[PDB]
Design a protein around this nucleic acid. Sequence first.
DNA 1: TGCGAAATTCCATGACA
DNA 2: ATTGTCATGGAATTTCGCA
DNA 3: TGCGAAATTCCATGACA
DNA 4: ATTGTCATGGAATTTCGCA
Lengths: 368, 368, 184, 184
Amino acid sequence: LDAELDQLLQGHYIKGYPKQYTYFLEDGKVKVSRPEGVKIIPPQSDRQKIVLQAHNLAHTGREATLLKIANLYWWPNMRKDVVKQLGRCQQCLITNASNKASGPILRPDRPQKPFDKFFIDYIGPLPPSQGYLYVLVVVDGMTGFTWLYPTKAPSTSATVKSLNVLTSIAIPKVIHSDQGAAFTSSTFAEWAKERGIHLEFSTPYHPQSSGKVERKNSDIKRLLTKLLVGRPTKWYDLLPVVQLALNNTYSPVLKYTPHQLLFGIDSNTPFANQDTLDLTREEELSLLQEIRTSLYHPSTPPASSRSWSPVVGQLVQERVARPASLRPRWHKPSTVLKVLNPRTVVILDHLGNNRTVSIDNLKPTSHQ
Amino acid sequence: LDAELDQLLQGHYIKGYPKQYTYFLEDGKVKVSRPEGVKIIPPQSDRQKIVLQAHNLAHTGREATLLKIANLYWWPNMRKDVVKQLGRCQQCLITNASNKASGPILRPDRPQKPFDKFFIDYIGPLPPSQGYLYVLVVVDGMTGFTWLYPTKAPSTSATVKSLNVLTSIAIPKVIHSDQGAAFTSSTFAEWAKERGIHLEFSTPYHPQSSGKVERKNSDIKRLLTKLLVGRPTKWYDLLPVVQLALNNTYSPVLKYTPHQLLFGIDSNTPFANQDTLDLTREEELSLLQEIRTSLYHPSTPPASSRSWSPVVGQLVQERVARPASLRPRWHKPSTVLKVLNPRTVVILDHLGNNRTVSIDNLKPTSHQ
Amino acid sequence: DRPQKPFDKFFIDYIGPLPPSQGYLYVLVVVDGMTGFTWLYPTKAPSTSATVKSLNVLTSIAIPKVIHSDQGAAFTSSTFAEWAKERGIHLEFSTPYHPQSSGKVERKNSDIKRLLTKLLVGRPTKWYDLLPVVQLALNNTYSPVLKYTPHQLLFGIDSNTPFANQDTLDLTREEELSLLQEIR
Amino acid sequence: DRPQKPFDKFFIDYIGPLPPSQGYLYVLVVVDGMTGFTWLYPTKAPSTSATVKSLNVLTSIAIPKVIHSDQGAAFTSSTFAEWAKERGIHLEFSTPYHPQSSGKVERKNSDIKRLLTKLLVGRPTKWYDLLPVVQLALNNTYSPVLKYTPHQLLFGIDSNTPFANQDTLDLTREEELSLLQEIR
DNA sequence: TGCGAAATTCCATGACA
DNA sequence: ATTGTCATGGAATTTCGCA
DNA sequence: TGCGAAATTCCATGACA
DNA sequence: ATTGTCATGGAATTTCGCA
Ligand SMILES: CCN1C[C@H](C)n2c(c(O)c3c(=O)n(Cc4ccc(F)c(Cl)c4)nc(N4CCN(C)S4(=O)=O)c32)C1=O
Ligand SMILES: CCN1C[C@H](C)n2c(c(O)c3c(=O)n(Cc4ccc(F)c(Cl)c4)nc(N4CCN(C)S4(=O)=O)c32)C1=O
Ligand SMILES: [Mg+2]
Ligand SMILES: [Mg+2]
Ligand SMILES: [Mg+2]
Ligand SMILES: [Mg+2]
Ligand SMILES: [Mg+2]
Ligand SMILES: [Mg+2]
Ligand SMILES: [N+]
Ligand SMILES: [N+]
Ligand SMILES: [Zn+2]
Ligand SMILES: [Zn+2]
């Protein structure tokens, strides 16, 4: 404060204040003669309040805040003091956008067998058809084979009725779903436990995690659309046709239809593949096991130049899910408890709850 | 048809049918022995109907359709026949997504003078404040200087009342706006003509074209948000403060505030810049003219590897603006009349109307 | 002659009337010839209509080349014939009074009837709900003749529900005397 | 001593009462000292409240270092003083009965009054709507003393509305005899 | 005529419904 | 008949203080 | 052992609220 | 306590028919 500034006036040297400039008194204030002009050097005990005033004009970041201060003042290391305040502005931290991208996505291993993992989801509401409004879509992870069920609501009870029909064929080890109300209810947990099926949930608000089924939703709607061109949207009676059509469509990268991956032989549908006509079923199932293990698997893409990756104990902010108008897009800062993998973390949220969360719904808190 | 296929059976050579394979009759059908197995060669008069049947199973593209046909059939140049049909499937053309990116954006020259061009827009609805629901945002193109007006509706009459207040200061040559109802009404055209102001409209549903004002909307909301944290959303009384705060905030790339670009001198606001205290106003206005012409201008970015650029007479499809559920995302194909610039075109739309349209709301029609 | 395959032939038949369950009275039984895989469908009647509605569900998953049945009314109607023709399914009938399948299918149909009888006694009205588990049992039941269950033969994998407890399938002295006092 | 600048000093004053127009009766006149730029605000009364509401609009665009006025009630109230203090504006009063500006401001205020009188006669009630054009006129009027209009001096550019037809500003024999029969 | 650190410039990221 | 923009904060680069 | 063209593979683009 | 995906159609590359 006035201590430091006194020593300075009487020509002594202080660390951080270059000796080559002449420091003087005028109007009761320590001034200095800088290339850019004459600036006031406020005492250290003033600086915080100044930075805050500059920042608060429009809640500006580093450079825009600095440019204001530099108009009137100079002191050693001004930006450090600017950055200090930015890291403490609750309003800036929870309102500003991130400017760092997530690390490159994971490409999880394709489940090894049909019925290892099911991905499920709702589509809807759709226009009413026969009094139905939603579609339950169930996709086998290994095969891509799909089941469709029309429902009146995205409810546990309708999910349960449909899965009882499906599981008549076979019971899966794991069912994967997002955290919609239908799948997180304890009624659904009980239904699953009763059958030895393990529920596995996506991190919240991150439908990429249910990518397998989400991607099939697109095809389902795309085919429904084409079929309904020029007609009223009577989709109910089309679900069976779509199911069959999609389960028997080739994936150009795979060179197989999901039916083929599931049964190792075409049923009596148009353009049925005849290549295994002379094999025994046993020989056929042997070739099938082989096809199933040699399927193309994509790999993790190159990181963007400005990606960030989570580190235990780092301050991070969860994205607000359905933010209201004129309200911050980010929650208050929280702490990375565990790094499950480079794209998934457990955080402690100031309440404090444990939350398993996608990196895509996080930003690193700025300025530490 | 049976003509071609007869010559083939009796060992003669036909163009397109490789001579090294043995062609035979069986079950009343011309067959051939291919590395992949034995396929039926249908007569040419059958092929169209076959491709169509394959395609229609699930309205598959090139390879997935081909893979079906190849199960049973072979003939010369099958994909040409596949592609022929894809280009004629109305349902596929208007429902499928594009897989080609637009050419790189234009960075239009910054207007030379304040008041050359105004960019205007509505924000809202916001939560009611004092019975107001919208904000009219007017941004001067050269300076970025901004005016804010609260309104009860995004209406011509409210736009007119506000612009009458604004234009009291100065009349702009051009006002740029999107095609919202407030700005396209003839009442607004009359209001503009009366004052010698030329209206210039964005291509529809392409707010990038109003980028200048759109970007200021973000800052306006961002600052409003910060200021309203922990309080009820009483934004009405804040508009003046926000206006002033933003017009006096530095752009780090420019090193000027919009007020400075507008007047060449800070008014009595906090941290006012003092650098021209010893210049006469004349000297000041001379330095201002200089600053205004030497401002940083960004340039057109590198094209993506799979961009497309419009060519006169090309078939293209306009994006459907607010598509209903289960309805195609694209209009029927149309023809590029004129290429206004690499990112803007005039199209004739089958009705046929002339429409000036953004390349971003177009895809090139596939398979010609 | 080419080897036998899944979807080569489906064998269908009705079972009932049964005691009502959620207003259902019959079961349409479908058994794939080659694998012995069984699908079951509850119906309100053994009609062409009920058959069509039920098979529409199954044939939205896999379509047989041949359906084989006895000469039941539902299966011999011209409507059912139209339905099969639309789908490119050839229909096959056993001569009247002389039903024939194969050893495998005959044995499977026997189990189905016996397994139903066993679980209906004691709760003759709860069977609608039990259909899913009845099927898993049937399809995860080991085949003496082949070394594999229908599940294994249809999908080429082990099931996540092995029914390693092959059941008695017979009636206990409890179930015998209380089945004779059920329809009494 | 440093040269004079825009926003150094704003000169304010009321004009009225006037004939009602959309329920307004007064005009708050604001003239920047250095440029001669004029802003006008319709008010319902010459009160501190009306002054504050009006200047709040103007000061959301530019804030003066000094406001100068005569000793009108509205300008000498402690409320108006609070308002100015909040904004870091120094208030300046001319001695009572001895109003002083500068040559430029005196001349500008003269034009304003004269230009208003000229356009009110014939339509004494339509003036509220005319304020925008009155201001453009005033601000695009060439200064004999400096070579430039206020617009040019405030913005450093030519205006898109040059008022190249410098008006008479005087009253025609029509306007004289029909202004004497207006308030009569 | 070169060092360590501060200052400035660069620029991907994201949001304007 | 028209056309993206620009605050933001780590990183990269340049400049500064001193010798 | 090399040519022209057909076939196949590659892969950015975009959409799953 | 978890994790993107994959149809699509021009372009790039490889293979094919023939010599
Ligand atoms: C209530 C439980 N829920 C949560 C949210 C509503 N959700 C969802 C669901 O099925 C969803 C989707 O299919 N898509 C479409 C989608 C978008 C991008 C993408 F990459 C992929 Cl693969 C799919 N978006 C969803 N989201 C709206 C925006 N975000 C909020 S979101 O969560 O991302 C979403 C749920 O069931
Ligand atoms: C009714 C007249 N209109 C047309 C549409 C509704 N519009 C609009 C308006 O002001 C808009 C926006 O500010 N933003 C925000 C925005 C989004 C992306 C972007 F790059 C930039 Cl620059 C801004 N989006 C709008 N759009 C919703 C989706 N599209 C339909 S859209 O047209 O792109 C939009 C109108 O006034
Ligand atoms: Mg969902
Ligand atoms: Mg979804
Ligand atoms: Mg708009
Ligand atoms: Mg907008
Ligand atoms: Mg029978
Ligand atoms: Mg007075
Ligand atoms: N994995
Ligand atoms: N331009
Ligand atoms: Zn802040
Ligand atoms: Zn099609």
